[PDB]
Amino acid sequence: MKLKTTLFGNVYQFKDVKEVLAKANELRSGDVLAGVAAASSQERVAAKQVLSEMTVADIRNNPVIAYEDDCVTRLIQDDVNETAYNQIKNWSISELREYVLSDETSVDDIAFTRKGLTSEVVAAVAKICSNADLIYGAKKMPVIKKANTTIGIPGTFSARLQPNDTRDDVQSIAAQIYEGLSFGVGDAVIGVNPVTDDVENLSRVLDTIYGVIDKFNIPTQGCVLAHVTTQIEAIRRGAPGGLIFQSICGSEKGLKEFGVELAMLDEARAVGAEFNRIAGENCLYFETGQGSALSAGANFGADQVTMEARNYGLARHYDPFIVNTVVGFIGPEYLYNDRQIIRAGLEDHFMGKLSGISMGCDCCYTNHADADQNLNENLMILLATAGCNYIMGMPLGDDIMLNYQTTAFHDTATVRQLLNLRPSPEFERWLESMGIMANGRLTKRAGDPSLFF
Amino acid sequence: MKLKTTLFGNVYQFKDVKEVLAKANELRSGDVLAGVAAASSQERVAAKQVLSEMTVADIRNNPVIAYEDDCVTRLIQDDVNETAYNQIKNWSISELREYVLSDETSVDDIAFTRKGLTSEVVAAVAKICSNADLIYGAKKMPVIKKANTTIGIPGTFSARLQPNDTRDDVQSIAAQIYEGLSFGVGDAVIGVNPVTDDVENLSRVLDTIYGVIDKFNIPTQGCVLAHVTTQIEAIRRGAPGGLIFQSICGSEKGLKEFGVELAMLDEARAVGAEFNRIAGENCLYFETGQGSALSAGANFGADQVTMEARNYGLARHYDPFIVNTVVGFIGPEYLYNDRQIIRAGLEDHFMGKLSGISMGCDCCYTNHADADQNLNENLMILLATAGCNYIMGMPLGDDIMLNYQTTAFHDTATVRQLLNLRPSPEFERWLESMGIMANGRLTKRAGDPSLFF
Amino acid sequence: ALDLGSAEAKAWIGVENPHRADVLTELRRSTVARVCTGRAGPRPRTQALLRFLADHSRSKDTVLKEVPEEWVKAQGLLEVRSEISDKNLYLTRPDMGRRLCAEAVEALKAQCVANPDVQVVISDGLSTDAITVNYEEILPPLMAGLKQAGLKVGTPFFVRYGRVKIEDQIGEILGAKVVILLVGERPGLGQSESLSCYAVYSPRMATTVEADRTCISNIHQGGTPPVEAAAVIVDLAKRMLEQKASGINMTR
Amino acid sequence: ALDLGSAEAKAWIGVENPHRADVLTELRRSTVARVCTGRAGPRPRTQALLRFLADHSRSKDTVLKEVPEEWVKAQGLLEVRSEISDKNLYLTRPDMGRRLCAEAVEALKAQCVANPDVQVVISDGLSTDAITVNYEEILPPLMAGLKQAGLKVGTPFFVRYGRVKIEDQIGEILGAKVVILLVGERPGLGQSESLSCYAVYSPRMATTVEADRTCISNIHQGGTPPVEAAAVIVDLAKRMLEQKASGINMTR
């Protein structure tokens, strides 16, 4: 391979694949913080060009943490379809980009091709895509999964109901649920992050969620987003199982930061198959986001976009119902402003869809990042056109408890009616039964949680 | 009226309607430069509050330049339907915002309500709209016009072919035309900014454009975007008339700066009806943009968003085929970065549609501004979902002559196929005849300008 | 006229033709999440957007604001620094917020008791209000809780510009068996008082991971009350020293 | 092995299965617009995107490139300065760019001739490369043809950080009957060396609008060549003085 190009008379030399991958990224504050970013715009473009000339073989055979040192690398490498790989191994990344974007490349073509990819190759393609490339490329790569709802059918748009409370107060949790359903939010999942990682508390939160589900016969899922260890215990001791959640990271060291073994995720799949109230075949739920491996000291000199791609390579192994990035969840240290948070969201979603997982996005920001609610609304709509599987819903997007701002209940209804998208067909049926939705639109008596009373 | 509110215990007092209008804007470079911007985030929200409590009569009876001194003000005030105005004059701007956004408000409801507005009231509504408010608000106010193509039908999306050259070389202009048509660009207009402002040069460029139109029987319009005086001369002395163009400004001082009288615009309409090769009833074409009034000394202490709305009040009088803002045409002095340029474009489009003109947008930036091509691609897609009537098309968006970057031919085809939008129905039929389009989609043979040879 | 910061503005119900407006009032009362504000189309109502925007202008102020060195001296605290000089650098460099500065190691060795059983560290973190509002209410009953009935208590000190991983360096230098850090988590939209406790048994800079910590979060007046949070941290420290177990390594 | 700045990359044709590939080559030869690069689906091809990105990195650098003043001193030119000090403050304050600073009035009154028929002003404007490439080829043969059969030519000088409305103040201070200003316009993507000439008859800061100026734009090797563009300004300077009419007031 060439680690070298000349641009405007000047030779641009790079040390390894890892450096080429890092410096080809669009400018973000985390890559500068990691020490891995390009020195200038010219070196950024030079890295992009060097990357685009490298083959699928070049980047498959150079993962950012080595096979023998890292269980996530082993996971990703072992999962490769080798005859799919052998077809594409001598493609340049430039050729792989144009293949993905081509109107003559079908969903069924990409279905087989993506099996010959690793996460680092997925990242490499994202690095040489413009914003419209990411959006159009993701749109022509639908990923469809089923729990009690079907998610990710083209022409549909789903939403997590996120009814969080500072005390896990069950009236406050219920009030936000009734509010969310009145806007048509919750077909992805009704999912609480709990204050206490504790079996009695988890069961109470789940009893509250499924109280509303059972009363009104809602086709959907419950989740409580504690550590996967305590979820499993709660469900084993007889709390209602819907989706089982874990935050994941793209290295073994990163998983150790989170207290996660691979065997816990095998166990969650096994517990789900025994216990969980799920009609379809997908019951797992992961969350991701750029900067988490950096924060862990677990990026090993790799940029945050390549590390985030390795999340999706990890996630794909377990065939989850839903994955989302939480795009600006941490703060300005890893993604500083609107421009960087938008770019990351489009990257993350594209890479998720290319890896073949059911990719949504928490379009979000923090109050110490240079960002406001207009950014959430820019990003949610751009991602919706990209066929993003789902966003979050909270009352005006205010988390009283996780201390950040996501998208409103309003915003899901807005996206759906702007873009002529429906909910999950099962959940849409339910919304029509309740008189909340007609022909994809909120009816007159929608947006009112008094309706359930 | 109240020119005063208290926020968090603190009294915020404003001097007049003009100050309230200025300071309620989202932060931008030009408002700071005009000296009219809010001192803090808290004062911005205070100004938004005061504005929202102000009534339609409050803002209508306070135009930013007075009736007696300014012919644009007079034109906007004289055009008011006084029965439509009397219905709404006691509405607060808050109630007008909610009325525009309401699903119970139809396109025919707004058709009458908008006739009771002035431009300053249009501006006032936009100032208290979030980014998704501007997009959803604009989308439910379609404006449809017809030349030889119909523009602005929901589910359609048009494009100006902008085949500009440094020498007005007719080979270089033609090459760019054949290129744009092969991507399905040019249903809005084929429109050249010339280098030389003289009659035989205008006639030669028009002969070049219409040479292609006549050879292939393209349903579309030609335009040469010189001063309206020289266009009229060219057409009178026998050059093919399509659309007639003028850059406009929102004050009499600003029009004087551009060297335009109102009577030239009346003459253009009269020359169009006599001469122009147009099947429909609309044949005028205006361009606008934030900062032009500031630049001229012609804003009179008003902010650029209010002054830009006054453009749309002026344009509305003349019932043009198309208007577009040229959103980041000037530079970082008036709109600094990605965030500001996106916000401007969304404001400008919403205000255009609310004023009831056939509003598109040149999604664009300059090289001395903090922006890139990913900005163009963000904005063009957001506006497309807002039902933006048209964008520009150039080869990769590189203007070799106006020294800025607009949207590519690629981008219109991307937007159409991303969002399942069609061309203008007449132009689409022609594209299907040429074997360039099937089912809204570029064929295999498309994107190839040698198809015409 | 209306102040957007007022309790009347916070209580406002915006749903325009309610099915049951008595339920609507019971639902608004039961949560501090921004429910029952209604809609214009699928968009938020104007007052709901205005009060959102007002709360954001003030939330933006709470992140960058700093407690005076005078207040820390008036608490009777040692003030000590991380490697970060100022608030601008703190936001972009978490790596330097996880390290004590050169004078910081020496001040701690000089002026802190050696080998505590429990070590209580305080940082402003990402919210000054989180420690400023809560301090006098949490710190006395915590300090009493640990020594008075119990064991050897290290001397309390304040870290300016601290991140959570800095308590691994603190526990090594002081030789501490348990390090309790009370720190300001990032400010919410309508809220900046939120304090968390990060506690780790016997930390080691190039060994301990984040899962080795126990978090108790959302300590404030609208959460777990700062008084009874002090009791639950003392009890956690008692259990920690008993089973010598870190975070996920703890039982039950 | 390919440089994206090279002539091979500029001329690259990317259309995959062309109808007529000989026509494509003549189309690419016809224009410096980026035609004939083809597509991947409806998106740009990779090389075309890469060359776009390469050219934009160079284009950003050209806007904040500045002339050496020892280049200006060794042109034989008076360097004079507007109100602006920074390149960063020039890019953000147009109002200070279109008036002179306090010593700039003083240097021009003491060192430049009073009441010329034609007065030539040079500014860097928004592109240094526009005046630095084209200077030796514009300025001598222009300042020939003004003195060479005309009348009283004023002494030429360089304004730093100028906008074009500064020539109103210059025309008033020197009493100048025609002021012509050669200035760098904003840099494009592929090219930085485009020069404009803005020209008033007898300008007045409280009177002359923008439409009173004659513009001639796109002066470089790829536009109107700077040799023969100097001839067309000398001709324009004659026509201006004869009919006493500035820009839009000029006949025909």
Ligand code: B12
């Ligand atoms: C931002 C955040 C994160 C970020 C971390 C920020 C970063 N890497 O810089 C990410 C996204 C990585 C994260 C991940 C997780 N987090 Co978290 N996190 C938060 C949040 C919103 C802010 C905390 C904060 O501001 N810290 C203070 C700042 C000043 O310190 P800092 O040095 O900048 O950040 C450190 C801490 O935030 C710490 N941290 C973050 N989360 C958690 C969770 C646990 C259990 C521990 C011990 C430490 C920890 O990691 C950073 C050190 O590098 C809180 C919610 C809240 N309202 O506080 C939850 C919260 C603390 N996290 C929670 C959980 C459960 C998790 C996960 C275990 C999710 C899961 N179920 O798998 C993972 C794994 C954490 C780990 N072991 O590393 C729970 C903790 C419950 C408990 N009492 O045990 C909380 C309270 C939210 C909730 N669901 O209720 N989280």
Ligand code: B12
């Ligand atoms: C930016 C720009 C504008 C801006 C204004 C400038 C600004 N505020 O920065 C806006 C958007 C207002 C604008 C408007 C128009 N412009 Co203009 N503009 C440009 C552009 C792209 C940049 C010029 C530049 O960089 N100047 C150098 C900088 C450093 O000077 P500045 O102080 O920042 O800007 C001053 C000048 O640009 C001047 N100016 C701008 N446009 C025009 C046009 C004419 C005829 C004159 C005399 C002066 C003038 O106004 C500013 C003083 O405040 C050029 C394209 C190019 N190739 O350069 C066209 C260009 C100069 N404009 C053009 C035209 C025709 C127009 C319009 C008359 C459109 C129309 N047909 O109605 C209007 C009205 C202008 C007027 N008479 O006041 C033509 C001029 C043709 C000619 N040789 O006469 C050009 C050459 C582009 C083209 N189509 O070929 N434009």
Ligand code: NA
């Ligand atoms: Na009303």
